Ligand binder design. Structure first.
Ligand SMILES: Cc1ccc(-c2nn(C(C)(C)C)c3ncnc(N)c23)cc1
Length: 450
């Protein structure tokens, strides 16, 4: 029935927009409109009404109000966050279980001289008729008690729980209904990089938000077609895809996205900090991208220009796929015919080059080339070969050989991505599964207790 809905603020929030409602952590509010990213609410205190970020609130006393609970985070991301600098031995998080829907799992930071810093995962079994336990020995009535216990001596766990994984306050969502924005709302500051169809600049939106802005040269794309495609792009929200905030619809077209501190994966890998990334880390980067592509696969979209130059790296080293789908609206006569020095021939599937048959399978081929760029620290594909020679060689059966520092198992995946018949290439869902669990040899990744 029309029951009043109440929520509690998970963080403080300062109004920056006109109809914004400011609140401090803990305050409770009534939900008036549940319009996606922003909700219209009412303060039980000042009785004032305004719009609030939907990700800043949650049901009262819900599980998301606890410091030790991490909602909607996968096993792999739980590992990446716990391993991030700032955490310590015993750092943990209780999260929703991916393996056993409805149940929970505990992730704990560990360490041994052989593997170094690692993250161990334990299944928390939910007993019918109340109860929680990792060990049928130490049972508890609530997750909080489970934490308090293991927070006092490991009692079997690989480690003694210390403190919750470090997390930074979620960034404010983009202004409500600010999809098509006036060019003057942006202040372009410094040039971040160039491109064949546009440049990328660092900028500030309405003096309050730092963003990256890609500027497309006039005539580089159909304005009407771009807009239609951008309306699909913006809906592809995932941790492994760069967020697309807004666009300026008049030429020169502007595509506003979140800013990624470490640039493209390509530049990052060729840099100093990049050269120091161990093979296991490079594989994890590959798994992250595959994860992003599996999302694109699920949503029936296509990247069309997948390559290391189009993967961005955040300050915490998280990969974000960029430019997905943009290639479809480029006008350039040569580019449209998959010809010329502007077209990504070396990364493109034979059927896409020959008949313009772009599908999620042509992206799989591209991912294979991307895998090679990654394992070689950004080296150019088919070194020394020209586009005509590559096209000819591939038709002959040629495939780039396996580099010295590239494990055979990783190379085998590349080879499957480069099958001439698109239907014989694996899905990104499969590729992600193989890369997420590429290591820790044997395993059923779920430390059993004890
Ligand atoms: C639509 C779109 C918009 C911007 C970018 C982008 N390109 N680049 C470079 C190339 C400089 C690394 C970036 N560097 C930091 N942050 C970014 N967001 C970008 C990519 C795609």
């Amino acid at each position: 029935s029309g029951i009043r809905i109440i929520v509690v603020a998970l963080y403080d929030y300062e109004a920056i927009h006109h109809e914004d409602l400011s609140f401090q952590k803990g305050d409770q509010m009534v939900v008036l409109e549940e319009s996606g990213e922003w909700w219209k609410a009412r303060s039980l205190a000042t009785r004032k009404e305004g719009y609030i970020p939907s990700n800043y609130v949650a049901r009262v006393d819900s599980l998301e109000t606890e410091e030790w609970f991490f909602k909607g985070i996968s096993r792999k991301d739980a590992e990446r966050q716990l391993l991030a600098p700032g955490n310590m031995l015993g750092s943990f998080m209780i999260r929703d279980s991916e393996t056993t829907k409805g149940s929970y799992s505990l992730s704990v930071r560990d360490y041994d001289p052989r593997q170094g810093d690692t993250v161990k995962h334990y299944k928390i079994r939910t007993l019918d008729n109340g109860g929680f336990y990792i060990s049928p020995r130490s049972t508890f009535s609530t997750l909080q008690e489970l934490v308090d216990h293991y927070k006092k001596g490991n009692d079997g766990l690989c480690q003694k729980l210390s403190v919750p994984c470090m997390s930074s306050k979620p960034q404010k969502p983009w202004e409500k209904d600010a999809w098509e924005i006036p060019r003057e709302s942006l202040k372009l500051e410094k040039k971040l990089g160039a491109g064949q169809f546009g440049e990328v600049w660092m900028a500030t939106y309405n003096k309050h938000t730092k963003v990256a802005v890609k500027t497309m040269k006039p005539g580089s794309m159909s304005v009407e077609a771009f807009l239609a495609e951008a309306n699909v792009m913006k809906t592809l929200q995932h941790d492994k895809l760069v967020k697309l905030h807004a666009v300026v619809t008049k030429e020169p077209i502007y595509i506003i996205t979140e800013f990624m501190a470490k640039g493209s994966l390509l530049d990052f890998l060729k840099s100093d900090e990049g050269s120091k990334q161990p093979l296991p880390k490079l594989i994890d980067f590959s798994a992250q991208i595959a994860e992003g592509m599996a999302f694109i696969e699920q949503r029936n979209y296509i990247h069309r220009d997948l390559r290391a130059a189009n993967i961005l790296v955040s300050a915490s080293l998280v990969c974000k796929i960029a430019d997905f789908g943009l290639a479809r609206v480029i006008e350039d006569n040569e580019y449209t015919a998959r010809e010329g020095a502007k077209f990504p021939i070396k990364w493109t599937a034979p059927e896409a080059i020959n008949f313009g048959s772009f599908t999620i399978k042509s992206d799989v081929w591209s991912f294979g080339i991307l895998l090679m760029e990654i394992v070689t620290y950004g080296r150019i594909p088919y070194p020394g070969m020209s586009n005509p020679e590559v096209i000819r060689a591939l038709e002959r059966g040629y495939r780039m050989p396996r580099p010295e520092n590239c494990p055979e198992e990783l190379y085998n995946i590349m080879m499957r991505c480069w099958k001439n018949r698109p239907e014989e290439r694996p899905t990104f869902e499969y590729i992600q599964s193989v890369l997420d669990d590429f290591y820790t040899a044997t395993e059923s990744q779920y430390e059993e207790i004890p």
